[PDB]
């Protein structure tokens, strides 16, 4: 997955999170192979808000 590096701070930065939820419902085959690093960029999201 082409690294999209950003830090979640503003409540408006939900667009980066919603981008994967939308991608996962179109290409399950492709998502099932790169779910790995798409996870750790989203694991950074869970450290900040929760």
């Amino acid at each position: 997955l082409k690294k999209i590096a950003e830090s979640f701070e503003d409540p408006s930065s939900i667009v980066v999170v919603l981008e994967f939820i939308l991608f996962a419902l179109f290409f399950p085959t492709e998502f099932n192979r790169i779910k790995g690093d798409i996870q750790n960029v989203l694991l950074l999201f869970f450290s900040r808000w929760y």
């Binding site: 830090s7 701070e9 503003d10 450290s47």
Partner: protein, 50 residues
């Protein structure tokens, strides 16, 4: 370490120091836009330290 420790200690400083700032915008009871614009600055200041 996954997430740097030295910077995570700084987050505790901002977390409780910002709480003290609110107690002044209740006595001078500024319009939320004023109290928000200072709480927003501490987000940028802290994320730079990372």
């Amino acid at each position: 370490t996954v997430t740097n420790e030295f910077a995570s200690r700084f987050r505790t400083i901002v977390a409780t120091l910002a709480n003290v700032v609110n107690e002044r915008a209740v006595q001078d009871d500024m319009q939320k836009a004023t109290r928000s614009c200072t709480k927003q600055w501490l987000r940028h200041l802290e994320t730079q330290f990372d």
